[PDB]
């Protein structure tokens, strides 16, 4: 079963990249690109159609460690589009993906393209979490942002700033993802009075 | 054969600017950077005959500047040889054409082309 997951994931990345690698009008660019993403989503749906509830999360930890083990950013973004359509179609509960994305210890700020694409995907899929999960995600995102130094390079700053849009989306009052009292409670638990 | 006949055929059958570029290439095997053949002069003559310029041949000249067919020096000389000045519309068209390449004005060629750009300025 672990081997089965490995096989499906490896073949999907390699195949989609290589057929698209040669651009012989293989594709029509607008929503047929969305259809190739649908194609990865269907391969993921077949793989999921075979698993128990208690085993629902260790496979997801394997998926995210396999995505974060990659090196090509196009490969990473292709598997993140697969994970996005796997959440959007209703196959995956949209809390396990976000938690295993952020709590993955390969997600460090030095992996700046991985940082940017990860927090882009969490900005995409955070709108469906219940509010207690949004509170725990707020806590772990703040603790991830807290590891950045006072000074970083001038090129990596915009890709680092992708977590700030997730934070701005959670603490936005009109979106109402969670009661704002929970947000200020988590913040003031992390930045108590007198701390910048 | 002549550049006037090629531009005028480009006006007769309505050619878009890139199709004009392709057929202008095909009519003339030696490119001669198009400035030996005075592309800017012929395009300005047959664009500035009316009281208002025809937008087709102005579109041809704006493509031939934005794409680097024609050097800025030949354009600035052909602009300099217009005067007349009784028509404000042709003068405004010439100032928009100058608004295209000015502040950029970068020759990348021989030093004689740079001296030509100096005299053209």
């Amino acid at each position: 079963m672990e081997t089965q997951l490995q096989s499906i994931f490896e073949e999907v990345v390699k195949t989609e990249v290589i057929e698209e690698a040669f651009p012989g009008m293989f594709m029509d660019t607008p929503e047929d690109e969305k259809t190739k993403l649908i194609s990865c989503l269907g391969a993921f749906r077949q793989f999921w159609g075979g698993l128990s509830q208690e085993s629902h999360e260790q496979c997801i930890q394997w998926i995210v460690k396999f995505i974060h083990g990659q090196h090509s950013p196009k490969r990473i973004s292709f598997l993140y589009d697969c994970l996005a359509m796997a959440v959007e179609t209703g196959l995956l509960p949209p809390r396990l993906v976000c938690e295993s994305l952020i709590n993955s210890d390969t997600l460090e700020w030095e992996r700046t393209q991985l940082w940017a694409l990860t927090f882009k995907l969490v900005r995409k899929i955070i709108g469906g979490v219940d509010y207690k999960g949004v509170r725990d995600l707020l806590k772990v995102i703040l603790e991830k942002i807290l590891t950045i130094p006072n000074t970083v390079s001038s090129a990596v700053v915009q890709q680092l700033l992708a977590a700030r849009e997730v934070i701005a989306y959670i603490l936005e009052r009109n979106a109402c993802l969670l009661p704002a009292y929970f947000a200020v409670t988590e913040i003031r638990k992390l930045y108590p009075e007198g701390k910048l | 054969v002549n550049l006037k006949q090629a531009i005028l055929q480009a006006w007769k059958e309505r050619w878009s600017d890139y199709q004009w570029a392709i057929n202008m290439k095909k009519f003339f095997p030696k490119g001669a950077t198009w400035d030996i053949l005075n592309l800017a002069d012929a395009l300005l003559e047959q664009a500035m005959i009316g009281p208002s310029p025809n937008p087709l041949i102005l579109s041809y000249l704006k493509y031939a500047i934005s794409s680097q067919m024609v050097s800025y020096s030949s354009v600035l000389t052909a602009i300099s040889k217009f005067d007349d000045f009784s028509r404000d519309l042709c003068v405004q068209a010439l100032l928009d054409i100058m608004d295209m390449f000015c502040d950029r004005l970068s020759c990348h060629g021989k030093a004689e082309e740079c001296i030509g750009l100096c005299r053209a300025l």
Binding site: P23 | S16, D17, I22, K25, K62, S67, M69, H108
Partner: protein, 157 residues
């Protein structure tokens, strides 16, 4: 291993002695020399390889401007093809240690304005650039440029 072990134990016991090869000589050379007789009777060339193999559509030359004969190199290409229209020249910045990394396309947004056609060229080119695999060559950039010009001719008409 078997039938050879005590030699291996002797020699591995006696490594790091400075008189080791003396000991081997004294114990082995007279037997061997009795039996066997006495002894015996500017620009990195990867880029020149790329440019030397390009199609005669492209006309790649070095920039008169920019630092020369140093780490990175800079190119101004061209495009000649009766089928394709004349287009802005394109500027490339090839790093030193060129393979194992991807060259960079110096973007000039201002000349890709002022026409709809050059705008379509530019949009399609940035699209195929995002579609490219990593650590691509120079010729991958030049061929995506020519394919972008061709798509922007076809999409327009």
């Amino acid at each position: 291993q078997y039938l050879c072990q005590p030699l291996l134990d002797a020699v591995l016991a006696n490594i790091r002695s400075p008189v080791f090869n003396h000991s081997l000589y004294r114990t082995f050379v007279p037997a061997m020399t009795a039996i066997h007789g006495p002894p015996i009777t500017s620009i990195p060339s990867v880029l020149q390889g790329e440019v030397a193999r390009l199609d005669p559509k492209f006309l790649v030359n070095l920039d008169p401007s920019h630092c020369s004969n140093n780490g990175t190199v800079h190119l101004i290409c061209k495009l000649d093809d009766k089928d394709l229209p004349s287009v802005p020249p394109l500027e490339l910045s090839v790093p030193a240690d060129y393979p194992a990394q991807s060259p960079l396309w110096i973007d000039r947004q201002w000349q890709y304005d002022a026409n709809p056609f050059l705008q379509s060229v530019h949009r399609c080119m940035t699209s195929r650039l995002l579609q490219l695999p990593d650590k691509h060559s120079v010729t991958a950039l030049l061929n995506t440029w020519a394919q972008s010009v061709h798509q922007a001719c076809l999409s327009a008409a």
